[PDB]
Amino acid sequence: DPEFMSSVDVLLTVGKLDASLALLTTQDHHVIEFPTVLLPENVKAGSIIKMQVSQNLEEEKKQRNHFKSIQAKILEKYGT
Amino acid sequence: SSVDVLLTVGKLDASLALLTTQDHHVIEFPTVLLPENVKAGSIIKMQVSQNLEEEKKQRNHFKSIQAKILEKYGT
Amino acid sequence: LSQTSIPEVKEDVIGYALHQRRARVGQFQDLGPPDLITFFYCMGIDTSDPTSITIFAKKITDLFISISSWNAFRKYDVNIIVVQTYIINSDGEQSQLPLNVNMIWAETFMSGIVRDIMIMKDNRADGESQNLVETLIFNPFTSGELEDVANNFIKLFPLVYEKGVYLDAPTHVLNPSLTNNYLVETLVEIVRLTKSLEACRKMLKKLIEIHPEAVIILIRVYFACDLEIDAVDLINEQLNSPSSFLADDSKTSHIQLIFKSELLSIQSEFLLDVKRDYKLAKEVAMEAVNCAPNEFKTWYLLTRIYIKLNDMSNALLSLNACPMSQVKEKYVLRRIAPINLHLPLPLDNPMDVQLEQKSADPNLVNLSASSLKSTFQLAYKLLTEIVQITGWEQLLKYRSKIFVSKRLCERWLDNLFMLLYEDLKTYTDWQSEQLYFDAQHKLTVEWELFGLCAKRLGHLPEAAKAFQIGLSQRFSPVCAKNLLQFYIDEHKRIRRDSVSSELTSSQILSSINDIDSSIIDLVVKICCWNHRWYIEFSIILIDALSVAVQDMGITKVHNEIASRFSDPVAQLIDDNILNFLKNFTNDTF
Amino acid sequence: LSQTSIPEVKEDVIGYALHQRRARVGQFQDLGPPDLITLIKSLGQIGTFFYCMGIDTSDPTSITIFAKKITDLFLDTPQIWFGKHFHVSKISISSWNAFRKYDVNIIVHIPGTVQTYIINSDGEQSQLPSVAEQDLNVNMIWAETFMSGIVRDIMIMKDNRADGESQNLVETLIFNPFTSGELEDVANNFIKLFPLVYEKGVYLDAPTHVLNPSLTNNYLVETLVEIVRLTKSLEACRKMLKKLIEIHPEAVIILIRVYFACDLEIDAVDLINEQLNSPSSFLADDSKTSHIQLIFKSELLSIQSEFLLDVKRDYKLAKEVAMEAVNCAPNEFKTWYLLTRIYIKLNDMSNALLSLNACPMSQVKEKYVLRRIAPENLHLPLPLDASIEEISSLNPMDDPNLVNLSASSLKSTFQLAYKLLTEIVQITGWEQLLKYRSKIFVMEDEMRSKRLCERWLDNLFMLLYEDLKTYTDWQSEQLYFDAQNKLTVEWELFGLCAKRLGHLPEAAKAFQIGLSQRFSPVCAKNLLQFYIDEHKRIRRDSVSALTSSQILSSINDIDSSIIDLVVKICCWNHRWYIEFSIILIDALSVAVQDMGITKVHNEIASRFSDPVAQLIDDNILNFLKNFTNDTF
């Protein structure tokens, strides 16, 4: 899938942790505030996670077609 | 335990992106961890997995480091 | 209008003031200090011309001097003595004064007007409450010599536009813009109150060629002039047409996206406040949130939309995700020289030498939901609005489901929860004893507090009752203000429900007339109470009395007041409120 | 001693100072104000006051003793008062507790009434009894006030190390805390009283470069380890801390930082190893909360890496540790700082910029500075006790390009990072640095892998530019002269520029020139520091494995200049009421470490008079001689 060739694979280390946020560190020295509830179940602290960031081009045209129809509907009802 | 998150791209600059879940989470992300034709108003899919072998690796590594430190200094 | 209404502070050394101004220039933010006059402050002087200021001083001295105004487009301080006209910089070193004098007067003028409107706009929720005693206040719409003031503001607008973001924004706006800022708020407010449309339309359409993003301002100006259809078509033009400024050759992500965010915000707020239709409103509000997740207004809207939707499961999460303002404060007048005063009495009724100083229930006055500021208040409102539909235990059932795969409540919200517990406690502990007692009293202040508590919780006539009670044993500005607000709310309710039955034509007419008369009677009292405290200017009073005018002929409205009140009082209400509508509203009737 | 080295500020209306301080109790919010002494004396009459530092607050009897000394000096001899017999009618002493924000004031009268009373955050004048007239929480009032006082005595020196312990509050008189106790050893007092206030220590906040204060990171622990280091009271600290371990297991950190200060590297390393690699470790137990364990783990690893970097250096191991340290505390300054320095010492210019950019900066937090509890008439006496040349006092009135330098005003973390920026620019050069910067940072607008510069770093780059510009301008304008054929202020300033940019001998000799021309405390300070630097450099290089004789001679001469500089600076401090300096004690310590204390006193007996030898004997040498235990 064209999305796979442009996919981005990262490794991050789970640092100081809250109920709210985990702070994640990369080897290129990015520090990221991340929702702890989105991390997997056993994730603990001092642990290592893989983030596979891919795109979606179907949902983009989906949301585009939704937006246009909504706006056209509003224009249809109120105003002209 | 693969966590699949679907995020929508907000205000976007050469350092930072603002991502938004449908669960109403807002994440401050770096743009360089995002695909090159990301723009704004694009839909991304973050796929999160734990890595056990890497944990084991850096565990043994750290142990070896500390052991070496103890050997060279002290006793 | 002479001597009376003019306070002053004793001068411990002559020229204690301007020195204490000069030093404190080094810590002036936002819209800055009021135009100090040596000692008493002032608002609403017409600053657009030094000849006109010399006229002001000419009248002022004729009846019976260093005046010091300020602009924050550029942080300097215009002093004039009677003609020593000069400047104090942020550095605080002095200067001297002689198109860049005209633009100085222009800037100080527009900044002045911004101050004079926004002091009465950001302080609406506490009823235009005035902390400083010493401040005299003019209706700014009235001070014109040779210049129709609002028309000047409109004509002087695009010269000082583009410098607007230096004036910052209302405290609920986290990310200021050329669109969102104090200046544009002042503009649309002035245009709304004056109904001075076809000038603003021309000026803005002139401005659109050089700056295309001010079509957002044109849209807000439309909505204020009751022209939704033009505004809606315009919105669709901006958000869909390829020719629009949002689709551009050179596209900034952020700076265009905040304008898209503002447009979708306007669209959703329009869809919600009028027109019901929570579905389309939510569908827009989600996109708006996606465009500006770091903004308060978007999440605020989405949360409100969820309520009407009737699912609070989402409202709670989208209330937690709502960003709060931890720094910016609402605009108040701050004194230059903190510290035996002077209090003249106009009145050409109500006046107690001792105010309050009477015990109150420790669990009444110590409720911390009162005095809540900024975003926290506006969130707590949504909270009470929710607990109205759910009830406490059902609310907790929703709460303990998603809070502590759940997520952490952001705290401020938990604080709000405890506050809701306390307010509900007080409400129940009042209304139980009240019911028990009402088979077979309490201080006016207690009625104020209880009414405010019930109004917080969303029990409107149960609060109007209490205010009406407290307004028996005394005069209270808070009671009169809130009661008047209740009457405006009921007027709106009845009129809105008249178009969409339930009530009948006769009932509608009678209720409308009773409400109108009660509205007038409530206006005059508060206007008087503001006159005794130097204030000739109120936006809310003008709004209310305007509503009566729409319902009934202005001459007829004048007659009712002339009858039921004295003659100099009728002259007063003619001046401070009705001379306006008669003339300054551009023949709107 | 006696009637000089005691500044005085008159008051138009009496009771002014106490009134102002009582009005100011609300806004203090600090380590504290300095202690306030207010005097009414007589033959109307006048009221005076001044600030003091280093008194023994552990017992009110001691305070009565102190006030009795103050009164006694006036009685023995008439006042000068710029041209009078005086005797104190009334003496007031006001000290601050910062564990619990209340101020305790002791008043002694000639009538002989000895009042003690308390003011708190409202200004509510609580009264103060004497031992139930419970009981222990009256002792603890004096105890906490005492520990608070000692913290305010040490930490004001320890926070102003980088500016040479400058004091911009002139009306203060400072003693040496270590020598102040009657009947009690102040250091030993602090050691005994530590476990009683250990919990409340964090309430004292921390230095500016500590973003997240802890039980083991705060002013109290720093005061402790500084005292123990200066006194070498190893056994008592070890005893009490070992006692404290059973109750509080996390204070094993403070044992380690003390083992280092008392220079047992081995047992300290064994200790760290035990804390980080044992199932028996307090980090291992599941009951205690993970993030509060993470903070302490981060501190441990930071200690380890700092040990591996600043001494006995393994840059690789220190790197591999400091990375884990960063992982355990990404929001702390120290971790990123260590990682950045290690990256520098490994030639990772690109890595350092990424990490330096990643260094979190202190906002809103300021280092401790003595402040004035009141907003021209004054008394500034001129001690004839010990005087040398340059006491001649002038009006140094006034190169605007050299004093409008921004980096001189640089604060805290920004300064400590600026030093690293110079540390890399002294390797890469300026333009190569610009290229490196351009390859990772976002440059000029009006693509992807480049990240955003933090814009305090941009300002650091601008300041680096102006610094290099002024430096090269000076060096050129001097090299053009080349002995074909200079102002002291400018010598100081240029010397500071070269000091910043990484150019040591140029700065040192610039200061030397300024010391030929005139006397400047700054010049003598930085010159002394330069001599200590050379001392350490030489002695460590020998450790590494200059000819042995070159070594010996250089050591001897360096010591022999260190003594002179120490003496002159000490006299400068005595001129301005300051009897105390950690820098001078530290400096003389290594001279005494090389050659016998006897011999150091002989060497100062040679070049200097007896008033001066006596003064130095008081303010440095006596403490090193008896007020540390048998290390020498």
CA–CA min distance D274, chain B (Å): 10
Nearest to D291 among A13, A17, A28 (CB): A17
Q: Which of C227, C230, C232 to mutate to test the interface with A (most CBs of A within 10 A)?
A: C232
Amino acid sitting at position C332 = V
DSSP C583: I
Q: How far from the centroid of its chain's Cα atoms is residue C388's Cα? A: 26
Q: Does residue D172 contact residue D53 with C-beta atoms inside 8 Å?
A: yes
Nearest to A71 among C239, C277, C408 (CB): C239
Q: Which residues touch D81 (CB under 8 Å, ≥6 apart)?
A: D379
Q: Does residue C306 contact residue C300 with C-beta atoms inside 8 Å?
A: no
Chain D residues 262-301 with CB within 8 Å of chain B: 265-267, 269-270, 273, 276-277
Give a three-class secondary structure readout of A19-53: CCEEEEECCCCCEEEEECCCCCCCCCCCCEEEEEE
Kindly write down the DSSP assignment for every residue of D107-169, as one continuous string: EEESS--EEEEEEETT--EEE--SS----HHHHHHHHHHHHHHHHHHHHHHHTTGGGTS----
Q: State the CB neighbour count (10 A cutoff) for residue D449.
A: 10
From CA D5, how far away is CA C573, in angstroms rounded?
Answer: 74
B37 interfacial to chain A (CB closer than 8 Å): yes
**Degrees, nearest 5: CA angle D16-D144-D119:** 30
A40 interfacial to chain D (CB closer than 8 Å): no
Q: Which residues of A touch D351 (CB under 8 A)?
A: 29
Closest residue by Cα to residue C208 from C199, C196, C217: C217
Full strand arrangement of the beta sheet holding C36-37: C36-37, C66-71, C76-81, C84-88
DSSP D201: G
From CA C394, how far away is CA C389, in angstroms rounded?
Answer: 9
Q: How far from the centroid of its chain's Cα atoms is residue D512's Cα? A: 25
Q: Which of B15, B24, B32, B48 to mutate to test the interface with A (most CBs of A within 10 A)?
A: B48
Structure tokens belonging to residue C157: 């607008």
From CA D395, how far away is CA D321, in angstroms rounded?
Answer: 54
Structure tokens belonging to residue D234: 């190893």
Q: Which residues touch D170 (CB under 8 Å, ≥6 apart)?
A: D7, D380, D576
Structure tokens belonging to residue C567: 């003659």
- Chain C: residue nearest A21 by CA? C408
* Alpha-carbon distances, residue D125 vs C156, C241, D92 (angstroms): 59, 73, 16
DSSP β-ladder status, C42-43 and C136-137: parallel
SS3 B43: strand
Q: Which residues touch D229 (CB under 8 Å, ≥6 apart)?
A: D261, D262
From CA D221, how far away is CA D256, in angstroms rounded?
Answer: 12
Q: Does residue D299 contact residue D214 with C-beta atoms inside 8 Å?
A: yes
From CA D209, how far away is CA D190, in angstroms rounded?
Answer: 25
D327 interfacial to chain A (CB closer than 8 Å): yes
Q: Which residues of B touch C409 (CB under 8 A)?
A: none
Strands (E), D183-236: none
Angle, helix D219-231 to helix D252-261, in steps of 10 degrees: 30
Long-range contact pairs involving C298-302 (C-beta distance under 8 Å, separation at least 24): C298/C261, C298/C265, C299/C323, C300/C172, C300/C378, C300/C379, C300/C382, C301/C265, C301/C268, C301/C269, C301/C272
Q: Which residues touch C369 (CB under 8 Å, ≥6 apart)?
A: C380, C419, C420, C422, C423, C453, C456
How many residue contacts between A and C have a Cβ separation below 8 Å? 47
Question: By CB neighbour count within 10 A (0-12 exposed, 13-18 middle, 19+ buried), where does D520 fall?
Answer: buried
Q: Is the dihedral of CA C117, C119, C125, C130 positive or negative?
A: negative
DSSP β-ladder status, D35-42 and D87-97: antiparallel
Structure tokens belonging to residue C214: 């001010």
DSSP C575: I
From CA C118, how far away is CA C132, in angstroms rounded?
Answer: 16
Chain D residues 448-467 with CB within 8 Å of chain B: 448-452
From CA D329, how far away is CA C216, in angstroms rounded?
Answer: 46
The strand pairing partners of B22, in sequence order, are none
Please give the class, per CATH, of domain D1-632.
Answer: mainly alpha
Closest residue by Cα to residue C364 from C439, C264, C462, C446: C446
C407/A78 CB distance under 8 A: no
Q: Which residues touch C506 (CB under 8 Å, ≥6 apart)?
A: none
CATH at residue A75: 6.20.120.50
DSSP β-ladder status, B26-30 and A31-35: unpaired
Phi, psi of C560 (to 5 degrees): -60, -45
Structure resolution in Å? Answer: 2.9
From CA C524, how far away is CA C519, in angstroms rounded?
Answer: 9
Closest residue by Cα to residue C35 from C66, C3, C73, C59: C66
Structure tokens belonging to residue D293: 């364990």
Nearest to A16 among D294, D351, D358 (CB): D294
Q: Is the dihedral of CA C452, C453, C456, C461 positive or negative?
A: negative
Amino acid sitting at position D596 = G
Angle, helix D186-197 to helix D136-158, in steps of 10 degrees: 110
Q: Does residue D567 contact residue D618 with C-beta atoms inside 8 Å?
A: no
Q: Which residues of B touch D308 (CB under 8 A)?
A: 69
A45 interfacial to chain D (CB closer than 8 Å): yes
For tokens 């006696």, the residue is D2
Burial C349-373 (b: 16+ CB within 10 A, else e): eeeeeeeeeeeebeebeebebeebe
DSSP C326: S
Give a three-class secondary structure readout of D60-84: HHHHHHHHHHHHHHHHHCCCCCCCC
Kindly write down the DSSP assignment for every residue of D363-423, as one continuous string: -S--------S-----B-----SS--TT---------HHHHS-STTS--HHHHHHHHHHHH
CA–CA min distance A20, chain C (Å): 5
| Domain boundaries, position A78 | 1-80
From CA D11, how far away is CA D44, in angstroms rounded?
Answer: 13
The strand pairing partners of D126, in sequence order, are D118
Give a three-class secondary structure readout of C458-480: CCCHHHHHHHHHHCCCCCCHHHH
Q: State the CB neighbour count (10 A cutoff) for residue D467.
A: 23
Full strand arrangement of the beta sheet holding A8-17: A31-35, A21-25, A8-17, A48-56, B43-50, B3-12, B16-20, B26-30
Phi, psi of C392 (to 5 degrees): -55, -50
Domains in chain A: how many in total? 1
Q: Which chains touch D (3 or more CB pairs under 8 A)?
A: A, B
* Helix/strand/coil percent split, chain D, to 5: 55, 10, 35
Chains D and C touch (3+ CB pairs under 8 A): no
Q: Which residues touch D111 (CB under 8 Å, ≥6 apart)?
A: none
Q: Which stretch of DSSP H or E encloses residue C582?
A: none
B18/C253 CB distance under 8 A: no
Phi, psi of D160 (to 5 degrees): -110, 30
Q: Does residue C316 contact residue C379 with C-beta atoms inside 8 Å?
A: no
From CA D596, how far away is CA D389, in angstroms rounded?
Answer: 28
Nearest to D291 among A13, A16, A28 (CB): A16
Kindly write down the DSSP assignment for every residue of D459-500, as one continuous string: HHHHHHHHHHHHHHHHHHHHHTTTT----HHHHHHHHHHHHH
Q: Please tell me the CATH superfamily of domain C1-589, with its number.
A: Tetratricopeptide repeat domain (1.25.40.10)
Q: How far from the centroid of its chain's Cα atoms is residue D467's Cα? A: 26
Chains D and B touch (3+ CB pairs under 8 A): yes
B32/D451 CB distance under 8 A: yes
* Helix/strand/coil percent split, chain C, to 5: 60, 5, 35
Chains C and B touch (3+ CB pairs under 8 A): yes
- Chain B: residue nearest D451 by CA? B15
Q: Which residues touch B43 (CB under 8 Å, ≥6 apart)?
A: A55, A56, A59, A60, A63, B6, B7, B8, B9
For tokens 């600059």, the residue is B13
Structure tokens belonging to residue D474: 């000076």
Phi, psi of C465 (to 5 degrees): -60, -50
From CA C117, how far away is CA C185, in angstroms rounded?
Answer: 9
The strand pairing partners of D172, in sequence order, are D51
Q: What is the dihedral of CA B31, B36, B40, B42, to 10 degrees?
A: -110
Structure tokens belonging to residue A59: 């949902």
D330/A28 CB distance under 8 A: no
Delimit the domains of chain C by residue range.
Answer: 1-589
D330/A13 CB distance under 8 A: no
**Degrees, nearest 5: CA angle D22-D27-D31:** 100
Q: Does residue D98 contact residue D204 with C-beta atoms inside 8 Å?
A: yes
Closest residue by Cα to residue C290 from C278, C279, C302: C302
Q: Does residue B50 contact residue A69 with C-beta atoms inside 8 Å?
A: no
* Alpha-carbon distances, residue D161 vs C11, D51, D164, D369 (angstroms): 48, 21, 5, 12
Closest residue by Cα to residue C540 from C193, C194, C225: C193
Q: Which residues of A touch C277 (CB under 8 A)?
A: 77
Q: How far from the centroid of its chain's Cα atoms is residue D429's Cα? A: 33
Nearest to B50 among A26, A34, A40 (CB): A40
Give a three-class secondary structure readout of C59-102: HHHHHCCEEEEEECCCCEEEEEECCEEEEECCCCCECCCCCCCH
Q: Which residues touch C523 (CB under 8 Å, ≥6 apart)?
A: C484, C541, C544, C545, C573, C577
Closest residue by Cα to residue C189 from C138, C122, C264, C274: C122
From CA D490, how far away is CA D514, in angstroms rounded?
Answer: 9
Q: Which residues touch D508 (CB under 8 Å, ≥6 apart)?
A: D495, D526, D527, D530
Question: By CB neighbour count within 10 A (0-12 exposed, 13-18 middle, 19+ buried), where does D589 fall?
Answer: middle
Q: Which chains touch A (3 or more CB pairs under 8 A)?
A: B, C, D
Q: What is the dihedral of CA C138, C140, C146, C150, to 10 degrees?
A: -170
Experimental method: X-ray
SS3 C181: coil
